Amino acid sequence: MAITLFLDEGLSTAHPEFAPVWAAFPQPTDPFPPLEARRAFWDEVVIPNLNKFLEPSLPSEDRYRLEDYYIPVEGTNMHVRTYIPTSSPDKTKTYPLLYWVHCGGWAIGNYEMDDYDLRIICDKLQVCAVSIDYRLTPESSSPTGAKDVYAGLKWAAANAGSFNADPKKGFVIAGQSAGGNLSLIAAHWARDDPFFANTPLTGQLVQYPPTCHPEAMPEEYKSCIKSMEECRDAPLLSKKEVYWFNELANPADPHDPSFSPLLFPSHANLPPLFFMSCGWDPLRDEGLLYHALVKEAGVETRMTMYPGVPHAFHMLFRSMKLAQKFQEETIEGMSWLFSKTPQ
Numbered sequence: 362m363a364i365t366l367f368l369d370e371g372l373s374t375a376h377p378e379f380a381p382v383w384a385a386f387p388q389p390t391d392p393f394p395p396l397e398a399r400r401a402f403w404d405e406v407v408i409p410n411l412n413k414f415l416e417p418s419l420p421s422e423d424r425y426r427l428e429d430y431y432i433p434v435e436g437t438n439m440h441v442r443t444y445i446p447t448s449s450p451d452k453t454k455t456y457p458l459l460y461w462v463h464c465g466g467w468a469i470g471n472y473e474m475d476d477y478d479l480r481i482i483c484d485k486l487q488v489c490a491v492s493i494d495y496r497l498t499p500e501s502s503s504p505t506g507a508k509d510v511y512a513g514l515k516w517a518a519a520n521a522g523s524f525n526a527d528p529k530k531g532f533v534i535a536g537q538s539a540g541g542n543l544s545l546i547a548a549h550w551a552r553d554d555p556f557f558a559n560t561p562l563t564g565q566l567v568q569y570p571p572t573c574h575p576e577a578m579p580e581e582y583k584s585c586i587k588s589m590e591e592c593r594d595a596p597l598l599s600k601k602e603v604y605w606f607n608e609l610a611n612p613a614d615p616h617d618p619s620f621s622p623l624l625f626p627s628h629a630n631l632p633p634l635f636f637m638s639c640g641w642d643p644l645r646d647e648g649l650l651y652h653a654l655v656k657e658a659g660v661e662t663r664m665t666m667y668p669g670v671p672h673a674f675h676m677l678f679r680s681m682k683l684a685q686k687f688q689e690e691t692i693e694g695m696s697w698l699f700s701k702t703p704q
Contacts, residue, residue, distance in 0.1 A: 364657040366585070367649050367664060372640030373592050376669030378683050383596055386677075393601070396499075396609070400469050407677055408473050414679050415477040420484035424448040427480075428524050434512045435505075437496075441513055442472045443524040444483035444490035457531030457699050459483075459490045460517050462540030462547075464673065466606035467498040467506055474676075475537070482692060486699065488533075489526035491517045495543065503612040504619040510543040511550055518560045528560040531702040533695060534632070538673060539606070541570030545622035545651070548631055561632075564698025568637040568691065569672055571644050572651040573623035574607055574615030588645035598672035600643045623651050628658040633701065635694035637687070640668035663697070665690055 375383065391398065425448075430441040446456060459482070463474045472492040479490040495509035514534065521528050534551075536544030548565050551557045578586060593600035612620035636652045638645055649664075656662045667674075667687060675684035 364653055366653060367666065370640075370666075370668050372645065372666070372668045373588075373595065374669055375641070376667075376683065378681060379670050379674065379678075382678055382681060386596075393605075396468060403465070403469055403474070411676060411679055412477050415481070419477060419480055420448075424484045425480055430516075432513065432516045434496075434509050439496075439509055439513060440472070440494040441516065442476070442492045443517075443526075444479045444492070445525050446483050446487050446489070448484065449487075453525075455522065455525050455527040455530065457486075457488045457533070457702065457704065458517060458521055458526040458528045459486070459488045459695065459699075460514055460532075460534045460544075461490055461492045462495070462510055462534070462536030462544045463492060464536075464538035464540050464676070465497070466602075467503070467539045467543075467610045468606060469497065470540075478688065482695065485692060486695060487704075488531065488695075488699065489521070489524055491526075498606075499609040499611060503610040504546075504617075506610075507543050507546045507619055510540075511547045514547050514551065515556060518557065521560075528563075529702070530704055531564070531699045532560060532562050533564040533566065533698045534562055535566040535695065536570065537568045537676075538570060541567035542572065542622060545570060545572065546619060549618065549622060549625045549628075552630055563632060563702050564635070565632040566635040566637070566691065566694050566698060567648075569639050569642055569644060570622075570648055570651075571603070571607075572647045573621040574612070575604070577616040577621050577624060578647070579624075582650055585650050586646045589643045589647075592641055592643045592645065595641045595643060596671040597674065597677065598643060603643050623647065623654070628655045628660065631655060631658070631660045633661040633698060634663070635698060636662065636664045637691065637694070638664065638666045639670050639672050639674060640666060641670055642672040644672060663694065665694070 428443045471494045493513035495506045618625040675687040
């Protein structure tokens with residue numbers, strides 16, 4: 362038979378609250394900023410401004426602690442940060458496990474991107490959060506980043522007790538944009554890997570991920586992908602930029618599921634999935650397609666659509682009331698997933 366499909370509502374017409382904010386956003390004069398300028402922009406503008414806004418919402422320093430690790434991956438070591446709640450009078454308490462994969466088009470970023478958000482979340486949800494510095498493109502080609510994310514997931518599962526986590530209490534993988542893509546890969550791998558038999562993932566949250574290389578989009582679905590042309594000039598992410606990030610990632614085979622998670626032979630028996638989409642985004646429809654395929658494979662699933670706002674608008678414009686709602690609904694989706702192993 363066929364399957365259901367999430368269609369329209371003026372998804373790419375500017376949200377009334379976003380148009381004025383966008384009108385005041387400073388844009389670089391470069392027609393196409395080079396990679397070093399994009400990395401510097403996140404380092405110098407996006408994360409400092411995000412942290413300045415989030416600073417008054419951070420929990421008291423008594424309510425959480427941070428632990429940094431350096432773990433082996435193929436051919437190098439990877440930095441891992443853990444976010445551990447410490448407000449209970451019981452210093453031996455163990456908590457559910459949240460494994461978070463940061464954004465950046467596979468080519469940008471590290472734990473700094475979500476550091477404050479995870480400090481907040483670990484206190485709000487009473488979970489141990491984990492964030493990892495997976496290797497970036499183009500210096501490392503796909504699937505190096507995905508393999509690092511997976512090695513970190515294995516490390517966090519096996520070593521949970523050493524930072525007061527217990528994945529039997531809940532084990533949620535979550536990722537943003539390219540990090541969501543890498544977590545989609547990791548969730549399929551983990552489903553099939555007997556390593557995880559005793560500590561399986563219990564849930565997954567993703568925000569607006571890429572799901573398939575354009576050159577590997579299955580013919581029968583090419584008609585579903587309207588956003589790539591309709592939103593080809595959308596704020597914060599153009600079609601041109603999507604293609605450039607795919608090129609930087611340089612997978613040997615764009616049809617392989619280790620790059621295009623849409624193309625795993627089976628999407629059955631994945632963790633329950635909370636999917637968050639931005640309406641004004643060239644990557645919108647491949648994400649909606651991935652969600653449709655996961656739902657048709659029998660996996661429990663929730664979708665939230667933010668019409669009229671671009672890719673990652675909540676990371677660049679967190680002071681918007683709408684952006685705060687996006688983060689609140691992220692946390693609510695996490696709470697839903699963790700409620701499947703309630704503590």
